């Protein structure tokens, strides 16, 4: 149809559950990456024909790829930049997952048309957002914020900024459309070359040497996010990836509990970048990925550019705003909504918690107050007690999710003040 999705709408972040990752043949990524992806996750390869599918299967077989995780879509494409032209994922109508198409900002008509084939393959509805856009220049936090470089306005110059913002609201549920002047001084003007939400409360911002012409622009961008309150109510934790030689360290893919970071030398500088991700993202497996010789990583074009995560059409979605830091009390009540996009019965919904840092986390059932709305109150806590917690839900489709996504390795933390 030509109508927007039935509300409310919520754009899905890259660090939410992914059912698959989308790549394209002829390839722009190394076979070793496809192999590593397929070890744990479904890889959907776009090919132009049944014969081309079989050519790819032969290559996957010869390279030892886990074929049980290899799926295919037959559709014409112009390029391997699946980040930039494939559809964007949003929840809509309470418990549905949909795809949002847009006008691809390149003269690549098969790439531009592709989202319809993606939606057909996935068995989900598609909605047409009439803005000139590109996925590389888009990221959302999963709480209604999105960051883009200035081309989101300048390539839609027949519309006012308000009209552009309204399109993002109507099709993606974006209420905070954070469009900024690109700090990189290069042609592409994509956020994924300088910035990446790692979680709702964490953002990675590129850093360069002091004498690099973009040094101050990037420091200013880091300061901007550090001063900004995030969706959870704390200031963003701002992490920095130092590019000594224009290495594309922010151009990584978060796929479930793994992070794939392009590396292109020197080894020590690559390892420093990987260390930043490891520090920022406890519990995640951080994986450095060397480029393919024929289609190497570039400063403006690397791993994030040549992949796109695919949301779970049956997503078990946990909506939660955490209790953090010094809390007054005397009640410490957490609330979460849990929705099954699989239309499955949800049970159990639990709070896992630990008090004052020792022993194992303990499970307590949350109380369902109304349909899909769960609460839990921490009892018996004394002044200055430290609480770690996370939420866990399961349904009878076999889905199991925590909030935060990674669960126990990175729990929410608060302190009981009793004041
Ligand atoms: N995201 C990432 N994007 C890289 C796209 C590179 C391609 N040469 C273009 O400019 O269209
Ligand atoms: Na399109």
Author numbering: 47 to 465
Text of the article:
To this end, citrullination by the only known prokaryotic PAD expressed by keystone periodontal pathogen Porphyromonas gingivalis (PPAD) has been implicated in the aetiology of RA. PPAD is organised into four domains: the N-terminal signal peptide (NtSP, aa 1-48), catalytic/deiminase domain (CD, aa 49-360), Ig-like fold (IgLF, aa 361-463) and C-terminal domain (CTD, aa 464-556). The CD adopts the canonical fold of ββαβ motifs conserved among GME structures (RMSD 2.0–2.4 Å). The PPAD active site is an elongated cavity with its entrance exposed to the surface exterior.
Among them, a His6-tagged truncated construct (Asn49-Ala484, tPPADWT), encoding CD and IgLF but lacking NtSP and CTD, yielded highly soluble and crystallisable protein, with significantly increased catalytic activity towards the in vitro arginine substrate Nα-Benzoyl-L-arginine ethyl ester hydrochloride (BAEE) as compared with full length PPAD. We have determined the 1.46 Å and 1.48 Å structures of tPPADWT and tPPADC351A by molecular replacement, which reveal identical and superimposable conformations (root mean square deviation (RMSD)∼0.09 Å), suggesting that the Cys351Ala substitution did not perturb protein integrity. Difference Fourier electron density maps clearly reveal an active site-bound ligand, modelled in the tPPADC351A structure as an arginine-containing dipeptide, and in the tPPADWT structure as an amidino adduct where its Cζ atom is covalently linked to the Cys351 S atom. The tPPADWT structure, revealing an active site covalent adduct, captures a midway step of enzymatic turnover, likely after the Cys351 nucleophilic attack and NH3 formation steps. From our structural data, the arginine terminal carboxylate group is fixated by ionic interactions with Arg152 and Arg154, suggesting a role for these two basic residues in determining the reactivity of PPAD towards a C-terminal arginyl peptide substrate. The truncated form of PPAD secreted from P. gingivalis lacks the N-terminal 43 amino acids and CTD, and so has similar N-terminal/C-terminal boundaries to our tPPADWT construct.
